[PDB]
Write an enzyme that holds these catalytic residues in place. Structure first.
Site, PDB file in Angstrom:
ATOM      1  N   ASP A 259      72.796  70.087  32.977  1.00 52.73           N
ATOM      2  CA  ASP A 259      72.027  69.298  33.934  1.00 52.73           C
ATOM      3  C   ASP A 259      70.562  69.153  33.495  1.00 52.73           C
ATOM      4  O   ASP A 259      69.643  69.197  34.322  1.00 52.73           O
ATOM      5  CB  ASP A 259      72.084  69.890  35.340  1.00 52.73           C
TER       6      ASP A 259
ATOM      7  N   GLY B  27      70.999  70.805  48.299  1.00 51.70           N
ATOM      8  CA  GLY B  27      72.116  70.342  47.500  1.00 51.70           C
ATOM      9  C   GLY B  27      73.421  70.859  48.082  1.00 51.70           C
ATOM     10  O   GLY B  27      73.473  71.312  49.221  1.00 51.70           O
TER      11      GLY B  27
END
Ligand SMILES: Nc1ncc(-c2ccc(S(=O)(=O)N3CCOCC3)cc2)nc1C(=O)Nc1cccnc1
Length: 350
Positions: free
Chosen positions: A147, A31
């Site tokens: 998230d 990421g």
């Protein structure tokens, strides 16, 4: 391959840096922060994950702060953290050493979806209950995950234990200071964020849990927006156009510049016919427009959808016993202690 050894402060414990050794490194994720590895601890042969992130040498790293203060069987434990340098020549990475859990809810759900099957409701209840319990825990600290998605729910498939992970968007919300609105993955993004709210609550996480619930019942995302703005349209195609008073309570400064008029689509018709009615009813109280109208994670735990999990005769489909669903701490119950009478059934009271 060989052995790597580092000096790692223990996660929640004292600032007593010790030598930890590990081997068998392989990439398992990445990421914007950097890279994630699987590793095997040379001492115990226990599998761990190592999230490696680029740390700006002079400011603090809020994920580390959030993780050092969490201890919960439905969250990934920060075992250790340590620093390292490389690839960036003269710059420093923070390394989080975390429980490794081998499966995810996304992969399970994908696997039944590819087989035109539905995950059985017993796994839906077990997974969703543990999710809500972990949200109740972090929300009691005012930490919002920002998230919740199926990819961030880990599973041991043999014990049916679930653990929340990826605290890369977690923030401790203070009342007053604003927060960025383009947060959560699109599919799971609550409607006040799409209206650009900046002083939202932790109920955005509860919205996202409802999206996960609904997805587990449908075998696919319930609100699959193709853009951050068409997300809101996909929502309206189910919940209907939000009343202006509902738009008032998402964010008061009307950045509401879009949509047309669409009656709500009956909650019973959006799911398949053999869907449990308690499931729908829990869904209907998670994905409400008005953020203060959503259930708290602790109340969703108390919801009658999870009564089977409170029975004394409950065992996993593989014959083993359920994980520990009732070992509640005073912190978990802090938002509404009188819920304990429902959450801790009699057959499990000391
Ligand atoms: N603590 C963890 N424990 C397990 C996994 C994890 C488990 C299974 C898989 S997997 O099924 O795709 N498969 C498995 C095997 O080899 C190939 C991949 C991938 C990751 N992640 C984490 C974690 O913290 N992740 C994370 C954290 C922060 C930001 N971004 C990601």
């Amino acid at each position: 391959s060989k052995v790597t050894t580092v000096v790692a402060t223990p996660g929640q414990g004292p600032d007593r840096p010790q030598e930890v050794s590990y081997t068998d490194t392989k990439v398992i994720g990445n990421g914007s922060f950097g890279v994630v590895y699987q590793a095997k601890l040379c001492d115990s042969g226990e599998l761990v994950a190592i999230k490696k992130v680029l740390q700006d040498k002079r400011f603090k790293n809020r994920e580390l702060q959030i993780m050092r203060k969490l201890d919960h069987c439905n969250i990934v434990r920060l075992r250790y953290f340590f620093y390292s340098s490389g690839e960036k020549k003269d710059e420093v990475y923070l390394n989080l050493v975390l429980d490794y859990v081998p499966e995810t809810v996304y992969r399970v759900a994908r696997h039944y979806s590819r087989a035109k099957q539905t995950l059985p409701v017993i796994y839906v209840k077990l997974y969703m209950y543990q999710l809500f319990r972990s949200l109740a825990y972090i929300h009691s600290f005012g930490i919002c995950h920002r998230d919740i998605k199926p990819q961030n729910l880990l599973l041991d498939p043999d014990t049916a234990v679930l653990k929340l992970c990826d605290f890369g968007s977690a923030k401790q919300l203070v009342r007053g200071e604003p927060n960025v609105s383009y947060i959560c993955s699109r599919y799971y993004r609550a409607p006040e964020l799409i209206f650009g709210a900046t002083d939202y609550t932790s109920s955005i996480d509860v919205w996202s849990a409802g999206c996960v619930l609904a997805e587990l019942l449908l075998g696919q995302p319930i609100f699959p927006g193709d853009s951050g703005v068409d997300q809101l349209v996909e929502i309206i195609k189910v919940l209907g156009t939000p009343t202006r008073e509902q738009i008032r309570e998402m964010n008061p400064n009307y950045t509401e510049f879009k949509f047309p008029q669409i009656k709500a689509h009956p909650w019973t018709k959006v799911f398949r016919p053999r869907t449990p009615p308690e499931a729908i009813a829990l869904c209907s109280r998670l994905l409400e427009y008005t953020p203060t109208a959503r259930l708290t994670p602790l109340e969703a735990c108390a919801h009658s959808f999870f009564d089977e999990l409170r029975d004394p005769n409950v065992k996993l489909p593989n014959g083993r016993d359920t994980p520990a669903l009732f070992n509640f701490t005073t912190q978990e119950l802090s938002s509404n202690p009188p819920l304990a009478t429902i959450l801790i059934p009699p057959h499990a009271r000391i």
